[PDB]
Amino acid sequence: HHDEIISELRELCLNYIEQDERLSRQKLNFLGQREPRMVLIEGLKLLSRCIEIDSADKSGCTHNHDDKSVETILVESGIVCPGLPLIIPDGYKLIDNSLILLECFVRSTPASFEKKFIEDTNKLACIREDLAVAGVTLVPIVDGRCDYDNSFMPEWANFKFRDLLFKLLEYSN
Amino acid sequence: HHDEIISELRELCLNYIEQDERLSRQKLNFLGQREPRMVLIEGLKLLSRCIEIDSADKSGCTHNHDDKSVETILVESGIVCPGLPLIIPDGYKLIDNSLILLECFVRSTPASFEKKFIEDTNKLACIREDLAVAGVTLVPIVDGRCDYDNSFMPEWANFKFRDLLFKLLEYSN
């Protein structure tokens, strides 16, 4: 049954995902879903959020909890940068006149890993000069990962959570 | 003749490598060599230094000009971190209580690119906790590149410089 899969996903979320406050909102969004395709989508977002927070912590920056744009981040610290592409980083840290910007990703093949690393590098590089004129030095960080492992979940639970999400995806295919 | 190759390398160094002060010492070390194997070694170091400075500038940090260790960097800012692995970053920036550490590399295949990215990531990750106890937050940056291009050299000159270094390597093989 699809209800059994959903119930297993619920118990993994509650018992095996570390109780970090930054995950609370997404865990609740996930637990509030009863429709299989919505459980699947919120489950993918939950596992992605674990990876992003893990990357922000390892990179020494603040996880972009409320999906703020670079434009928004600078405005909130009293920095005016007019005419700037829409970039939503995974992490950020405005320190003195330096703006740490973090992009993280997961790729499973070396060729897709390198392609994505170069794309994320170019994405951040595009705003270096725009920030420089506003007196801000870009510190761009690209964190590429080869798997979906993170500090908030034991490896077996992360694997089981992905196995259950796949069964839910098959049920909706 | 090997003297013709050396003379061509000399003119490329002087006429086609941008006159950035951070390259001056290595350009002079290179120009002072007359033996083929020493011209080759100093030429590889020169092209590597162009890439490292280019990475430090793009990463918003200071190029590690005098190959200082992490231990040394912290001592010079009045930060005592006792018992720390020997790590010489390509770049650094101590800002407030945050230590930006930069590792850069060039790899020509996607598999070697990913292998090296993960190794450089782990190298920096090893000191996160050691720095954390000394009140310093590590901001580790790994800049992987797919080629030897840099802002200090036109693409044709960078290619010719590598072509001439290869002919010098063949002469010494």
Distance, CA of B110 to CA of B112 (rounded, Å): 6
The burial class, CB within 10 Å (0-12 / 13-18 / 19+), for B167 is middle
Structure solved via: X-ray
Q: Confirm or deny that B4 is annotated as ligand binding.
A: no
Chain A residues within an 8 Å CB radius of B142: 142
Does the distance separating the beta carbons of A58 and B117 come in below 8 Å? no
Does the distance separating the beta carbons of B60 and A117 come in below 8 Å? no
Q: Which of B95, B115, B117 sits opposite A95 (nearest CB)?
A: B95
Q: Selecting from 3.40.140.10, 3.10.520.10, 3.30.70.2640, 3.40.390.10, what CATH number does the domain B62-146 have?
A: 3.30.70.2640
Query: Per-domain residue ranges for chain A?
Result: 1-61+154-173, 62-146
Annotated resolution, angstroms = 2.1
Amino acid of residue A92: Y
CATH class, domain B1-61+154-173, is mainly alpha
Residue found under tokens 């800002």: B95
Residue of B nearest to A96 (CA): B95
Phi-psi region of A144 (alpha: psi -120 to 50; beta: other; left: phi over 0): beta
CA angle A143/B92/A73 to nearest 5° reads 55
Secondary structure (3-state) at B139: strand
Distance, CA of A119 to CA of A126 (rounded, Å): 11
Please give the order of strands across the beta sheet that includes A62-63. A62-63, A91-95, A98-106, A137-145
A82: which DSSP letter?
-
CB atoms within 10 A of CB B18: 12
What ranges make up the beta strands (E) of chain A? 62-63, 91-95, 98-106, 137-145
- Tell which residue, A154, A19, A127, has the closest CA to residue A73: A127
CA angle B150/A142/B58 to nearest 5° reads 30
C-alpha distances in Å from residue B79, one per residue of A32, A59, B34, B71: 48, 20, 43, 9
Cβ pair A166, A8 in contact under 8 A: no
Does the distance separating the beta carbons of B118 and A114 come in below 8 Å? no
Distance, CA of A127 to CA of A94 (rounded, Å): 15
Does the distance separating the beta carbons of A146 and B118 come in below 8 Å? yes
Distance, CA of A13 to CA of A29 (rounded, Å): 11
Q: Confirm or deny that B3 is annotated as ligand binding.
A: no
Distance, CA of B165 to CA of B162 (rounded, Å): 5
Buried b (16+ CB within 10 A) or exposed e, B31-58: eebeebeebbbbbeebbbbbbbbbbbbb
